[PDB]
Amino acid sequence: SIMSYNGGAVMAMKGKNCVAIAADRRFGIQAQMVTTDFQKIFPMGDRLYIGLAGLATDVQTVAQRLKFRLNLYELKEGRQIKPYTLMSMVANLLYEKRFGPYYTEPVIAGLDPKTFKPFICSLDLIGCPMVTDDFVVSGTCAEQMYGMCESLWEPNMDPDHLFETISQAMLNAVDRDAVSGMGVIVHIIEKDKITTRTLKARMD
């Protein structure tokens, strides 16, 4: 398919007071990789990221159009953007191309800019929002990622076991996938600091 042209996987997971997000590193064309440093997670302010998966054209395109509208919003207002406000912003930007759609599926993770309250959501390729309380996934290897998080997620989790759960969720699901792999980067953010780690995966 068009979604399976380059492949990819984006997973976000809500913890107790922190939130974690992870993605793979492989950039390829249908059988043939090119590099292992293709960025799919982009910062949108502090304590709030966004992940993109699908066709690599629309990954680099939407992440610049969203950054275009974001800097105009944070200069007309004095404050930063709320996570609900960004979800309504992205859903507007995908619905404008209703019939010539972008081939991407965004994942938004972040905290409250006032409290420690986390937030996760994911959207369709035409812009239907969907908020949950445990996890959201996107990419080609979706069904393997549902089998992990339905069997490993717990409600109230410290940032240590949240890191260990989302690590085992990615390393078992992406290695089952063929067109995705070549390393996994994990962002785990909280109220006071941002921790970014790279995992040791199978490079085959």
């Binding site: 304590r47 035409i126 600091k193 941002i194 970014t196």
Partner: protein, 220 residues
């Protein structure tokens, strides 16, 4: 997806499930398919999820603009006229199955709107994939001028019929009661299904994952 509605002797009862599928995989266990339009009119959606969301916000924006200009309460025939005229112009490319219900000065009114522009005023309607199961409950057990608790028994029975018979449906049951003065919205009403308990401890402790490179960035 199974939505339904009925008109009892004083108002309108709407209902739906909260499952939103994707292909053959359950994507959302708790969706929301009953929408706000005005303080007296709600609407239930079916079909393409983004097409129902972006349409129901535009009409609710226009009726807020209309009623604040008139200074009065909106009418259900106004929202019917906007939807059948908008969807006909887009020639059915916007797939949105709708159930429109509200209480006016003239009383309760119920409509069903098909994604081409054909509209029907009926005392009871069903839309969605499992709409055939709920319609068999309606025709078997309808009588005119029911009470409120008799009608709430009927809709929650009909939505549950689409839960246990259709693959695309099956979750918690929403309800809403719109009357001449009272407005009730029940995001849980009946939980028919649970999840079983986890038997095996699967947790390995912190340190069972190999990490290549870490990075710390403090904030304020």
């Amino acid at each position: 997806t199974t939505i339904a509605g009925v008109v009892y002797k004083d108002g309108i009862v709407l209902g739906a499930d909260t499952r939103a599928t994707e292909g053959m995989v359950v994507a959302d266990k708790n969706c929301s398919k009953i929408h706000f339009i005005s303080p007296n009119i709600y609407c239930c959606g079916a079909g393409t999820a983004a097409d129902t969301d972006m349409t129901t916000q535009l009409i609710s924006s226009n009726l807020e603009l209309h009623s604040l200009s008139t200074g009065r309460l909106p009418r259900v025939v106004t929202a019917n006229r906007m939807l059948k005229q908008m969807l006909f112009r887009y020639q059915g490319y916007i797939g949105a199955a709708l159930v429109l219900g509200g209480v006016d000065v003239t009383g309760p009114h119920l409509y069903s709107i098909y994604p081409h522009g054909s509209t029907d005023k009926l005392p009871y309607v069903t839309m969605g994939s499992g709409s055939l199961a709920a319609m068999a409950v309606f025709e078997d057990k309808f009588r005119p001028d029911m009470e409120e608790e008799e009608a709430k028994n009927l809709v929650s029975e009909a939505i549950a019929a689409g839960i246990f018979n259709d693959l695309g449906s099956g979750s918690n049951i929403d309800l809403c009661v719109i009357s001449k003065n009272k407005l009730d919205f029940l995001r849980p009403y009946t939980v028919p299904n649970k999840k079983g308990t986890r038997l095996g401890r699967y947790r390995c402790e912190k340190g069972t994952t190999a990490v290549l490179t870490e990075k710390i960035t403090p904030l304020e």
